[PDB]
Structures are given as structure tokens and as C-alpha cells.
Structure 1
């Protein structure tokens, strides 16, 4: 039941997205986060990876992403968590 969830808040058009990961077993895991924004007058894309030790039974905040989303803006946040063995978790925001 190890999973990735997204905690989100909104102020007008400012969005704060905090990807969360809760694991049944403790791991040395590779965490990949791909964020993309395609606005009317600008585009932005962030690829970030981090290999660190994660504890079990606790929700871990992976990153804090602040995005300015307006009508018709293409936004995508893909988070991938893998231990290198049998665990591979991939979730996308918006759900």
C-alpha cells in the first residue's frame, strides 16, 4: 500500500503542490520529479532526481512546487519513486 499523493492549496492563481510518499518498507529510493508549465506567454520545465533513504509508515514531503496556473495553462507534475528492486511508484498531478 505504498503510494504517492499530492497535497495542494490555492491562492487565486497561485498553486502550492507538495508531493507526498508513504511506504510500507524503509528504502534507499530514487525519487524523480518532473514538473511542466505551458502558459500563454511562457513555458517552464523542471527535472529533479534525488537518491535518499526513506523511512516506513510515515508520509514524506518530497518537494514544494509553486506554480502560477491560469485558464488553459498546461500543467503536469510527475513523481516517480523506485528502490531499484521491486518498488516502482508513479503518480501525476493534476489527478
Structure 2
């Protein structure tokens, strides 16, 4: 399987999110990570794009997000990996 998965842990309301990608096919690809955090205080929105040469059958850590998530907050993280051709993966956190 080629897939995006999320390594996630928590210490109190402190959350660490590490998106990971494994490819069945060695390639060059475009990786986009979007994150959105909304609370009563305010909002944080990140958009990050990188072009990456990636080997197959190896998990790759795509970035590391440290978020502070209270019970009232919303978080959404969308990770996409594509070559504009036959590779297109997309996954959202939380599941």
C-alpha cells in the first residue's frame, strides 16, 4: 500500500502531529500540508508545499506540527502527495 498516515501523541492539551508517507513507487512528487486551528481566542492556518524525491517502501516524515488543542477547538490537517499523473494521495487528520 501507498498511503499517508499520521503519527500522533499527546501530553495534556499539547499535540504532536507527524504526517508520514510510504510509496510503493519510487518518485519525484509534490507534497502539500494544510493545517487549520480555530478556537475562541483566534485562528492559525498553515500551507506548506515541497517537491521531494522519495524512495519506495520507506516511511517519510513530512513535517512536524505541534498544536495546542482544547476541548472547544477545531483542528483539520490535510496532507496531499501528487505527481500530477497517476500518483494522488490525500488524507485528513483527525480521522
Q: Which moved more, 1:81-90 or 1:13-22?
A: 81-90
Over 2 Å off, 4+ runs? none
- CA RMSD of the aligned region, Å? 0.6
Q: 5+ residue gaps in structure 2?
A: none
TM-score by length of 1: 0.98
TM-score by length of 2: 0.98
| 1:84 Cα offset (Å) | 1.9
Give the Cα separation in 2 of the matches to 1:29 and 1:69.
31
Q: 5+ residue gaps in structure 1?
A: none
Give the Cα separation in 1 of the matches to 2:18 and 2:8.
6
Paired residues, number: 95
| 1:79 Cα offset (Å) | 0.1
Deviations 1:39-88, CA, capped at 9 Å, x for gaps: 11011000000011011000000000000000120100000000221010
| 1:89 Cα offset (Å) | 0.2
